[PDB]
Amino acid sequence: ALPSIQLPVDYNNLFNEITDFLVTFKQKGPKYMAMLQKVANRELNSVIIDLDDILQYQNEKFLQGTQADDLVSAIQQNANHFTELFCRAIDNNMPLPTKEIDYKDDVLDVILNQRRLRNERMLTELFPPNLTRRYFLYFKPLSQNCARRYRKKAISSKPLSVRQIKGDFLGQLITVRGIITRVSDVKPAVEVIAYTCDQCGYEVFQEVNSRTFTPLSECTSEECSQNQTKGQLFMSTRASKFSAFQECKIQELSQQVPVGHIPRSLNIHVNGTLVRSLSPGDIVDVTGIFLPAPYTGFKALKAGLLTETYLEAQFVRQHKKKFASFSLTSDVEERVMELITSGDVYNRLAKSIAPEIYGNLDVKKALLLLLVGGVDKRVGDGMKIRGDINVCLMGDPGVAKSQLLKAICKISPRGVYTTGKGSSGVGLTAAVMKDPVTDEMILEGGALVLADNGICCIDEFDKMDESDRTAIHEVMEQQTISISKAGINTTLNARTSILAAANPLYGRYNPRLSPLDNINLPAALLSRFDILFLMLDIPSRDDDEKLAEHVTYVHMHNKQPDLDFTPVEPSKMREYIAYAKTKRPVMSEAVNDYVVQAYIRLRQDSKREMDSKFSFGQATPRTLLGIIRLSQALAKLRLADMVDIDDVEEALRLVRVSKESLY
Amino acid sequence: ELGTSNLNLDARNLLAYKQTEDLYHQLLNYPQEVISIMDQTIKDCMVSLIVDLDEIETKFYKVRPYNVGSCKGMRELNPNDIDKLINLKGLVLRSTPVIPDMKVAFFKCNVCDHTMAVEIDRGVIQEPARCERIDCNEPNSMSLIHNRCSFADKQVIKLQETPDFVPDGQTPHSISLCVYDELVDSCRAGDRIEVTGTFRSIPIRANSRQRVLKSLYKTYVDVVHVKKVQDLAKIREVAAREDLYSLLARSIAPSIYELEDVKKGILLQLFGGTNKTFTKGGRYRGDINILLCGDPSTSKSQILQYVHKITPRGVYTSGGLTAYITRDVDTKQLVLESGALVLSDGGVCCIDEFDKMSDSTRSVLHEVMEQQTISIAKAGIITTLNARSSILASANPIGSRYNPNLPVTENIDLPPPLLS
Ligand SMILES: Nc1ncnc2c1ncn2[C@@H]1O[C@H](COP(=O)(O)OP(=O)(O)OP(=O)(O)O)[C@@H](O)[C@H]1O
Ligand SMILES: Nc1ncnc2c1ncn2[C@@H]1O[C@H](COP(=O)(O)OP(=O)(O)O)[C@@H](O)[C@H]1O
Ligand SMILES: [Mg+2]
Ligand SMILES: [Zn+2]
Ligand SMILES: [Zn+2]
């Protein structure tokens, strides 16, 4: 039949040591008594056990010649059995409730009390403990400094990659590291399944741990056990016990993949209160149990010994970074006090964005004014006004406008970079097309990538086809996206700033009429944009010399040079942009005459647009709207709830300098 | 005095009383039994209050409780809330045809042509193994009759969460819905509704050949409540005013400065002419079509939006617009779908960016104005459809400006007959 082998592990002494540790441990008295007491009062919902506590307790008790074996090693070599032992030990020593309980809400306990008041009145079934349990058992991996405290190599941890895990690690406790890409929804799963027995005394119970379940047909009720049936047993949803279930997969990082290889994947299961503790697109290090899963679910009658494997989550560190929604704290309050004491700030912020690229202060100032936003939140009668600024960058190849775009995208949490094709699921369609395993065809219809309060950045703005160009024509001026294909009208409220970088298809500027170059795009789209800035490469010794010296000094140090002098830091301005957006100044009336006469002189300029050769000086009311928005932004970025005429003057100078690059 | 059978019941008024809040909590825990006993109580209360007894024995009584709790989303639904009342807001994605539901079986002893009616419970039917007539008493002579039974109309509604619950560009989630009787067809595609009902879970059959069941249960919500999100005397008082024309013209566009004549024309074409179909001569067009041209600095799209939302029926499109045979996505069938122009029968069809109209669709317009009837001959389907719609379009000149010296035809780039 089954031959037997001898192992140096016997569970009785281990269980006794577990009970002794759980009762006697001193880190308030015993921690493990206080937490169990809070569990008894229906306050706590999960149990976490620190293996470092067990290790240090055993190490300090080894000073007396009583201990004989180690338990953390057995935990590492096997975990699920010790989970069962821990829950048995906890249920054995569960304390009394020292607090009052709202006892009427526990419908499961009310039902069980009714069942008992039935059965024991006639003088009863021993219900399994897992049905009555309310807590969850979780583990916590050791810490490397704790291992260094002693000579022994009780290490664990060591966040192996997905591909570095091999077949002999099954059953142990391991830690993985990677990026989360897919997270499924929350779905309830059964733990104990109960059947009602049609008034035939006790209601038969059943317990299943496999992923496949089979129901009952006949019951052991005494009158049902009689020679003829008494009612057909039915499954009752109220009496049974459930548990939240969620599954995800994790991808290997691009750093850890050996050259010439494709990254692998790893499924992960999470149950209990840890559900919804992770989101797609973050770097984490999960600790859990590596378990096998039968291949019989596919039901091919093949793979006689081949089986699938998955990880069971126990503890996760979210890692990465936190945006925190600029939650107010004292430290950042003194930081903004320092910024206020710093005086004029916008020039420093412009200097501090991209020191790698030399000069180009106007574009950095424009980006800073863009990061705050223009006037928004509507006007009287409901007329639409959009606070996002639409600026386009013109320049020949080799000006590092793409590098500056990458810098602004990295430093802005809402930035997104797109381009003409290359990837198809980025424009005119959502990312949930034909995604679910059921091919449920989840879709919103007409939508873009994070178009709400986003910063869309595009390189080669002349490259994309008619579809994306029509998409931009739909997004013009915060207009909603209303493209329908199958009766759907779930429009996405697009409110985003537009960042466009492109070049004339000749790749260089020309002495002839400048609108002939423009963007090789319709003029209607061009008139939409708020600020047009041209970067023309002019061969000059006194400027190219400085540019070359700066670039070679950057290269020589293999780091950012000390040649730059920026008191501000990228995270510093990351906090300050949110701080300045929070202040939100409102408009003032005394500038209406000034802006009206400025618009009159702009129309005077339009009277001379036929002079040609830089014909971009055309007539548009959106020019007045844009100058108003830019004055609002020039009041927003640094000033308090006040709009100054100097803001209008600075906006006018910005417009003039933007036109000046034409020559 | 009305004869209907319908009750509305708010929870807050139900909450205001001290004895009733206990019934409130018990309703939260046990919906079905409380609702059933409440309906029985109302059935008794009708007779207790009338003291014609004939209209009561035919009708039933049901309640429609609402506002039990705050609206919860699909992103936070713990398994602890199974078999409890919750409120949901969402947008309807798709409906389904009525699904007959078995309620009463009809059997027949084919040997002796004897029939009996059998009730069912929980869907499962206990088949009788022998005919009740002991005179024949044969076991295998009992056969079911499908079309002589009684049925109920079940319908499944697909619901999506409102977009306000997704702050960080995630994807929405879909929750299935179930309705009964008067709730059938109460919602259509694109409707924004709020519902009140209990939660439910059900096992999945997996393989239909065996009795194996998956460890995961599908979740769906059964609801009992839905909500969405002599004036002629006043007319003639206004109709007697002398300067009603100017005020009515200027009321359509409150923010547009000047442009009075175009506003008058647009209002008058919104009023529309007459239509007549005298036999010996044929029908005459009653629609009015207007075109707008100018540089893109006139806010001419704002007037398009104004007329689109003011008019009773109208479709606002851009530069496909007519009927075409389509392949149904979710179901592998073939469905005929009507276009935007057909959908604007009797209203105003709004067209924006009329210059970039391609070339294949323009002829379609050349067909729809001079005859107002479009035909299609594809996939073996030959038919004619009525449009009878008004057109109002906007166009832009070629170049940054419209030069007054050049005539209109060159700048707009439209065929002379279509403009004519
Ligand atoms: N002023 C500058 N300071 C520093 N580096 C610069 C500067 N101008 C260009 N570069 C260099 O240019 C490279 C990136 O610029 P890039 O060629 O992508 O610009 P682009 O104008 O967007 O062109 P393209 O469309 O051809 O990619 C980097 O290697 C960067 O060092
Ligand atoms: N007389 C006006 N009154 C108010 N707003 C105007 C006026 N003229 C132009 N505008 C503004 O300028 C814009 C003109 O755009 P428009 O010419 O309608 O674009 P399109 O190319 O879609 O026709 C409008 O959005 C409007 O806000
Ligand atoms: Mg580039
Ligand atoms: Zn029974
Ligand atoms: Zn018979």
DSSP A337-391: HHHHHT---HHHHHHHH-TTS---HHHHHHHHHHHH--S-S--GGG--------E
Cβ neighbours around A415 below 10 Å, total: 19
Rounded Cα distance, A422 and A285, in Å = 32
Amino acid letter, B340: A
Rounded Cα distance, B39 and B26, in Å = 16
Amino acid letter, B136: C
Return all residues near B281 (Cβ < 8 A) that are at least 6 apart: none
Amino acid letter, A418: T
Put simply, the answer to whether A243 touches B79 (Cβ < 8 Å) is: yes
For B:343-372, CB contacts with A below 8 A are none
DSSP B110: T
Rounded Cα distance, A79 and A171, in Å = 7
Rounded Cα distance, A350 and A368, in Å = 7
Rounded Cα distance, A456 and A475, in Å = 11
Rounded Cα distance, A54 and A82, in Å = 13
Which single residue is written with the structure tokens 């780091």? Answer: A559
Assess if CATH 3.90.110.10 describes domain A329-658: no
Torsion angles phi and psi, residue B104, rounded to 5 = -135, 130
Torsion from C-alpha of B221, B97, B330, A443, nearest 10 degrees: -50
Distances (CA, A) of A105 to A111, A285, B106, B131: 11, 38, 44, 49
Question: Counting Cβ atoms within 10 Å, is residue B68 exposed (0-12), middle (13-18) or buried (19+)?
Answer: buried
For A:479-498, CB contacts with B below 8 A are 486-490, 492-493
Torsion angles phi and psi, residue B176, rounded to 5 = -75, 150
DSSP A485: S
Which single residue is written with the structure tokens 């009023």? Answer: B271
- Helix A621-636 with A645-660: angle, nearest 10 deg: 120
Q: Most A CBs within 10 Å: which of B127, B297, B356, as the mutation test of the A interface?
A: B297
Helix (H/G/I), strand (E/B), else coil: A520: coil
- Across the interface, of A188, A214, A515, the residue whose CB is closest to B217 is A188
H-helix or E-strand spanning residue B317: strand B316-317
C-alpha A416 – ligand 3 centre gap (Å): 16
User: Please, after which residues is chain B broken with C–N above 2.5 Å?
Assistant: 51, 229, 319
H-helix or E-strand spanning residue A290: strand A283-293
- Across the interface, of B93, B212, B396, the residue whose CB is closest to A524 is B396
Q: Which of B142, B241, B138, B223 is nearest to B187 (CA)?
A: B223
Which single residue is written with the structure tokens 């320049």? Answer: A395
Cα A470 to chain centroid, rounded: 30
What end-to-end distance do the CA atoms of chain B give, in Å?
63
User: Is B296 within any annotated ligand binding site?
Assistant: yes
Rounded Cα distance, B80 and B28, in Å = 13
Torsion angles phi and psi, residue B396, rounded to 5 = -120, 145
Provide the token pair at A245: 């279930």
Which single residue is written with the structure tokens 């035809």? Answer: B409
Provide the token pair at A293: 């899963």
Helix (H/G/I), strand (E/B), else coil: B375: strand
Rounded Cα distance, A292 and A247, in Å = 15
Nearest residue (CA) to ligand 1, atom 17 = A398
Distances (CA, A) of B143 to A390, B113, B121, B148, B337: 75, 10, 20, 12, 44
Long-range pairs for A275-280 at CB < 8 Å and ≥24 separation? A275/A186, A275/A244, A275/A245, A275/A246, A276/A186, A276/A246, A277/A316, A277/A318, A278/A180, A278/A183, A278/A248, A278/A316, A278/A318, A279/A180, A279/A183, A280/A180, A280/A181, A280/A182, A280/A183
Chain B, nearest residue to A482 by Cα: B317
Q: Which of A568, A473, A453 is nearest to A523 (CA)?
A: A473
- CB-based contact A238:B83 (threshold 8 Å): yes
Q: Is the dihedral of CA A215, A221, A227, A231 positive or negative?
A: negative
Say what the resolution is, in angstroms.
Answer: 3.7
Report every protein residue that has its C-beta within 5 angstroms of ion ligand 4.
A 197-198, 200, 224, 230-231
Q: Is the dihedral of CA A487, A491, A492, A495 positive or negative?
A: positive
Ligand 2 mutation pick, B259, B298, B306, max ligand atoms within 8 A of CB: B298
Nearest residue (CA) to ligand 2, atom 18 = B299
- Across the interface, of A381, A441, A486, the residue whose CB is closest to B255 is A381
- CB-based contact B71:B118 (threshold 8 Å): no
Return all residues near B220 (Cβ < 8 A) that are at least 6 apart: B175, B176, B177, B178, B200, B202
Cα A202 to chain centroid, rounded: 49
Amino acid letter, A70: D
Contacts of A215 in chain B (CB under 8 A): 211, 213
Put simply, the answer to whether A212 touches B203 (Cβ < 8 Å) is: no
Put simply, the answer to whether B214 touches A442 (Cβ < 8 Å) is: no
Point out which residues pair with A296 in neighbouring strands: none
Rounded Cα distance, A462 and A500, in Å = 9
- CB-based contact A237:B82 (threshold 8 Å): yes
Q: Is some CB atom of chain A closer than 8 A to the CB atom of B401?
A: yes
Rounded Cα distance, A84 and A289, in Å = 14
Point out which residues pair with B222 in neighbouring strands: B178, B198
Distances (CA, A) of A450 to A468, B168, B196: 15, 8, 32
Rounded Cα distance, B324 and B377, in Å = 10
Rounded Cα distance, A479 and A469, in Å = 14
- Across the interface, of A214, A244, A489, the residue whose CB is closest to B212 is A214
Count helices and strands in chain B by DSSP H and E runs:
11, 19
User: Is B295 within any annotated ligand binding site?
Assistant: yes
- Largest CA-CA distance found in chain B, in angstroms, rounded: 106
Rounded Cα distance, A488 and A87, in Å = 51
Task: Specify the pairing of strand A495-502 against strand A452-459.
Answer: parallel
* Chain A with chain B: Cβ pairs closer than 8 A: 96
Q: Which of B341, B289, B349, B344 is nearest to B316 (CA)?
A: B349
Helix (H/G/I), strand (E/B), else coil: A193: strand
- CB-based contact A288:A314 (threshold 8 Å): yes
Rounded Cα distance, B301 and B318, in Å = 11
Put simply, the answer to whether B172 touches A442 (Cβ < 8 Å) is: yes
Torsion from C-alpha of B128, B133, B136, B140, nearest 10 degrees: -10
Q: Is some CB atom of chain A closer than 8 A to the CB atom of B23?
A: no
Provide the token pair at B207: 């393989």
Rounded Cα distance, B339 and B365, in Å = 13
Half-sphere exposure of A417 (CA within 13 A, CB side): 15
C-alpha A404 – ligand 1 centre gap (Å): 9
Rounded Cα distance, B83 and B30, in Å = 8
Provide the token pair at A119: 């059965």
Question: Counting Cβ atoms within 10 Å, is residue A176 exposed (0-12), middle (13-18) or buried (19+)?
Answer: buried
Chain B, nearest residue to A470 by Cα: B319
Rounded Cα distance, A187 and A269, in Å = 12
Provide the token pair at B178: 């179930």
What end-to-end distance do the CA atoms of chain A give, in Å?
95
Provide the token pair at B29: 């825990």
Q: Is the dihedral of CA B342, B344, B347, B352 positive or negative?
A: negative
Provide the token pair at A159: 């966040």
Question: Helical H runs in A78-150?
Answer: 80-92, 107-119, 129-132, 144-149
Rounded Cα distance, B160 and B144, in Å = 40
Cβ neighbours around A274 below 10 Å, total: 19
Rounded Cα distance, B90 and B69, in Å = 16
Rounded Cα distance, A492 and A482, in Å = 8
DSSP A482: -
